[PDB]
Symmetry: D2
């Protein structure tokens, strides 16, 4: 019976160790992700009622850990110490696959269970949830591993039972760890906002098709008989999108109207803007082989693309957005929005139901998680540096923890 | 049997006259609405299958006729002559009450029927409608009396049967003519976009509460047990909103952050903006008597207010907008939109179902059309000049045609 | 500091007493409700986390307590002792108004809060709820006060916080206690099953219009601009329905085709049945003043009426049922159901959201709880005997507990 | 230019012939389908506005033509002559693939277009449709080729443009003609009744899995990641269901509680019935590998199975039914229905949107039409005799018309 076990090792099934290895960010090393992370020994948090301790086999890589490593737009360690927190470190990571190792009171999962996690927490007793709100939209919702300490970049992780989903048996630990953040988010975007869900025959414009969200979105649209049109910044990435089932792709480099909308009273500026948007639209028609608009636009690029997305969406269509990679000003030409009765929908993460459904589709082989590269535990910094520099490969990445 | 009948007079019931009085805009008098309209004699258009000729008793006043009179943002007469049209005049008007006077083939309405109109046309055989689209959202939808010639500022008007709704018997001709454009639009905004419809207990932020849309919206929100908070620009208008059932009102003059959003990277500008939005939010809490956000925001003011509306809406809430009085740049802070999963919904006019439902509520006395002033046929110019100058009274206005 | 307080009295606010008065059913007095209940002193159950102790001011009367008193179709005390329960008595009651007197850990309500209860419990951690089920439909749902011991026929009652709703201030304790079981159930029936919810202009057939459910249903249908047609068994009861806003009423005594459906191959029997159903339908047309079918049928009478309800419902309409007063065989002629694409929907109780919404409408005066008679605590037996004998008055009844 | 062309031949593209070959039922040969049909020459009906004349390449086989051939439950020729019809024959057939040969006024399709038909007509100007009804549910809806004369058992057929859908290019004429009636109906059953549509992970009980509806249903359920459990009457048919993607199958011959429900007060009869239903339920659990209920039950067998279907459906689940092969008494135990809040939904045919969507899935290869046998034009009688005698093969059948 030991305080600390090496990675790959653990106390007897059913028992939590006092301490563990984890990858820590500290304020004194805020900056370039490559130098922000270091493996250290820390105390394992307590397992409360309704919680489990997971032996983490692999963990996913995420934009949010880049933010954490930089200390912007927020000093996570300081923001957390105000809440009354004692730790002067941050353990990130918001996707994982692993094995349930110990269980708290009231839990139905048993030690040995293979799980993947949806890295969202909420208060199941919240007033809004009680009166019918989807938990992920609760005032009490927060992102596990980013808005809270003790994420998945750790030998063991305490998770609430409701966060857990059955690991698809066909997947490696890395592949199972890499997908939930992007796949479940894309699934909620495309199928979570009635009555604007992808139907057979629907063209769907997918920004960043070769990226994490986009790679899952293309497969989902194809799977339901929709017509996925991907946007990319290289032929190589376009080819990846074709392999995933895209109808075709549009090279964003061939346009230069990207960015905020001019004042709608600036007639010359609007005419210039419209020229670019219409050129993009004609290219969309070309890829589609017909003069039709996308019924749904899968957004996340944000400021650069939102005006085009709004223009492109069909009458009674939806632009659904879960981020703003290029900036947070989403400039809408209200005329397109109201006259054609379009929906601009914000979306974030997924419900437990959605996490379970996308997991089912992945398990049955309808959808591939698109694992592109696997890192060792000592390479967490390198992995996030790649994302920081926009040099990460297409698809999703993973880090080995206890898995070999 | 005469070619032309004076206002108030008509051929025998069942028979269309060859000619009629109508209020005409001509290009040579484009400009100030007060001088744009003149009564002239014109040929009555043919009544085709599925159409009826209505003896117009009263007609509603509308922003769109101001646009028509100005010749901006479009020369309606020229835009229409390109389509191949022969007329060198425009007869506006997009709300009416009247009596069915003659019927085309296949029509179920009989002469004598008292009707009010939803001034929207669409092709009932349209591809999109056939595949399930709500007709008002069709690629084939257009506004009768504005996007088409021969509106309701005329002794008789040809309308398609599907545009017709039973006139509430309790209303004067003026009151029955004044309401459809605003009341049905507000009804679609508040009850037409599942799952974001007003429920008992929901706070609803209503811009322009004393205006046409707002006056109906406050009553509708109150009627279903929601909590209407009105925005106004005077105490007198606030008092009107209270009489309509508002919980309270906010004076927009007390804030100065109105307008487009700064670049989200401009930290000083954003902090200034947020200070104003939060001040507005605290005032909202005060009127409500509790720290809660509006679940639905009824928009139409547009550029000045949209950033505040987006900020204000509750998690999983909706900002629904049908115009842009102050401008067409709707600037969204994507962070508020996606992180709290908010919906920004464009809406326009109403479906026939919605027109019929709001008519039912008005008929049964649940909702008052808010007729504020009635004009004579020779005062159509004056009436629209008032709107042009923003000197029109609260509520909705009407013009007498054949009614005395 | 005393073990036991007389009705109307209590320990200091914030403190639970060791014992209390309650109205008990015991197996040795199973039978006629009038002799089944007796006031006794019992131990007050513990208040756990998330629970509160309510000082019960008044309690509602309910069919279910008749079942309990009879010992059919279930010996509640025996069924409960198998679960491992120790008590040899049953304290019924499934509606109450009262004052929060003591609170468990984690509760947001404070002592002094005036509440009414939705008498449904469920496990907020249930698997089905976690994956998106409405809690009232959970595998874990059960009726508080009937399927569990220690209901509201008691000086104090332990309730879970999620069961609580704010007592409308305008109502007496009796009126506030009498409504939730029927009003929230009717509200879920009529507004809870999208897309089949009552819209302005919809005719709605309401069985038992003068009864508990029906009295609320008529008001709700009228309130939203629907057209309520009530079924009754006397002119006096018809007149009550008119006062509540019914368009008119149908006397069920004038028909004799009630009951199970004949074999659909029995042509003479079907022709006889259809003759009665069509006669009922023509009477419906008469009350309505037009040849239209009800879009929604509010059911609960069950076996006698279901075949007629199914026949009557409009194309794409709904028959929604929450009980089977006359029997549990609901015989459907599948031809009417499939050819006209009708919905037969089972419904039970309400969600917390629905309980809160109907409470809001009652609070604002849109809906009256229809309190018909108030009893003293020693008359609980008499009150339920009335229901047993079908001699109870129209509307809803209540029993005073601590209220005077 | 000839009056009459042999099968396989036609006038020049764009031109309708005066006469055509067709397969006729006449009253004097009502009875066994094998002797009810005879090829004769008839006049081709006129092509009106919005209509097209299709050169029929192949036609589907259908239960409804058996009814027609028998003259029960209706003498179609007599029922139609009362409407004022002149013909003393009936040309059946309600599925077809073919080539548009001539077009009426206003039509967008061009001669040469390859189409399959949804054999439903409605009035696009109907009051109910105008106020929002799905056309297939209209008071004006009827089945083309059965409720109307001049179906697809004819060299040419007049169809309304809205009935037409693009023929999947990969399919033979026979395969394209065989699927719409069953595939679109099953698609509406499973995906047409929000919020009860098949989701990934949902078990679905499918009666008649090897049949027309069932064969499509199994594929659809599998495709969306649901778990299809088929009911069959032979091992051979079970094996077919496995090939289509079923999780497993249940042999209905192993149970004998099938049929109408006993009176719910008959305790011995109910206990016997429940024993059979529970045995069926345990077998369902076995096939599934877990103790779960089907969320959706795909019904059509009717009287024999409905009580079991209602018992089997999960809490808040749906039994959706489009026929009653075994009889029209659908006996519901209201206790299961209301206490567990289950939906019993009638469904018929499909909307145009649904026909187009299932066609898209078939075109893309997600779904196979399951063509089991193709007949010559002179074998229409034989084909329907097979169905009459329940000796037809699994899947769907077709008849060649102009195709070779
Ligand atoms: N729960 C959530 O809210 C949630 C979940 C997942 C992701 N997100 C957010 O969504 C965004 C995308 O995530 P991801 O995992 O898909 O990242 P990713 O793998 O980096 O993919 C994003 C892709 O967007 C494209 N892109 C970059 N700049 C662009 C521009 N100016 N215009 C158009 N496209 C551009 C790039 O592809 P090309 O260069 O080929 O165009 C890029 O690879 C991130 O901001 C992320 O934080 C949010
Ligand atoms: N089918 C459709 O799409 C449809 C239908 C109806 C209306 N609309 C559009 O909706 C808009 C409003 O229509 P309405 O009939 O209600 O007109 P209205 O009667 O003039 O009411 C609009 C009100 O908005 C308020 N307002 C004006 N400037 C504002 C600002 N800068 N910030 C905030 N509030 C301001 C004013 O009230 P206070 O000064 O008291 O704030 C004004 O009376 C118009 O642009 C109209 O064209 C569209
Ligand atoms: N959560 C739930 O599931 C829930 C909630 C509330 C009620 N329920 C159930 O719903 C049923 C009605 O409840 P309630 O509170 O409204 O009771 P109620 O006050 O007794 O009203 C029921 C009315 O139904 C009518 N009725 C009786 N026999 C009939 C017959 N053979 N045909 C047609 N109508 C008949 C009677 O009115 P006329 O004689 O005037 O026709 C009677 O007053 C009960 O079985 C109850 O248990 C269930
Ligand atoms: N638009 C519409 O409303 C529509 C559309 C299509 C079909 N339908 C109707 O739906 C029904 C089925 O159509 P289909 O095309 O699938 O016919 P089908 O190919 O004959 O399949 C029906 C299957 O049901 C099963 N069955 C027969 N008797 C049964 C019993 N007593 N209990 C349980 N299962 C039984 C049989 O399979 P096993 O012997 O292997 O169990 C049979 O092959 C027909 O009545 C048809 O008229 C309606």
């Amino acid at each position: 019976t030991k305080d600390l076990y090496e990675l790959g090792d653990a106390p007897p099934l059913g028992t939590a160790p006092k301490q563990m290895y984890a990858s820590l960010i500290r304020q004194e090393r805020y900056g370039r992700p490559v130098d922000a992370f270091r493996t250290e020994v820390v105390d394992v948090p307590p397992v409360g009622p309704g919680q489990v301790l997971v032996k983490v086999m692999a963990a996913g890589v995420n934009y949010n850990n880049v933010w954490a490593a930089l200390g912007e737009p927020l000093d996570v360690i300081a923001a957390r110490q105000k809440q009354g927190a004692t730790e002067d470190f941050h353990i990130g990571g918001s996707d994982l696959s692993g094995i349930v190792w110990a269980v708290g009171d009231g839990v139905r999962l048993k030690p040995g269970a293979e799980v993947v996690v949806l890295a969202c927490r909420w208060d199941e007793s919240a007033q809004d949830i009680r009166l019918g709100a989807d938990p992920v939209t609760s005032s009490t919702q927060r992102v596990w591993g980013y808005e809270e300490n003790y994420g998945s970049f750790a030998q063991f992780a305490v998770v609430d039972e409701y966060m857990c989903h059955p690991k698809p048996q066909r997947l490696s630990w890395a592949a199972a760890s890499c997908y939930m953040a992007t796949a479940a988010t894309a699934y909620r975007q495309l199928f979570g906002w009635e009555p604007h869900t992808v139907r057979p025959g629907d063209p769907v414009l997918i920004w960043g098709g070769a990226g994490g969200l986009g790679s899952i979105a293309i497969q989902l649209v194809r799977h339901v008989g929709g017509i996925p049109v991907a946007v990319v910044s290289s032929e190589e990435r376009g080819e990846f999108c074709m392999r995933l089932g895209a109808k075709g792709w549009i090279d964003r480099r061939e346009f230069d109207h990207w960015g905020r909308l001019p004042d709608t009273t600036d007639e010359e500026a609007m005419k210039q803007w419209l020229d670019g948007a219409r050129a993009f639209g004609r290219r969309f028609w070309e890829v589609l082989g017909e003069r039709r608009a996308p019924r749904i636009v899968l957004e996340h690029s944000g400021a650069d693309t939102i005006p085009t997305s709004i223009y492109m969406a069909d009458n009674a269509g939806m632009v659904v957005i879960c981020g703003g990679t290029t900036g947070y000003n989403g400039d809408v030409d209200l005329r397109f929005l109201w006259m054609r009765q379009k929906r601009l929908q914000g979306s974030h993460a997924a419900s437990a139901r959605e996490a379970r459904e996308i997991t089912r589709l992945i398990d049955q082989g309808a959808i591939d998680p698109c694992l592109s590269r696997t890192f060792g535990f000592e390479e967490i910094g390198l992995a996030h540096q790649l994302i920081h520099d926009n040099q990460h490969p297409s698809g999703n990445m993973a880090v080995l923890v206890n898995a070999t």
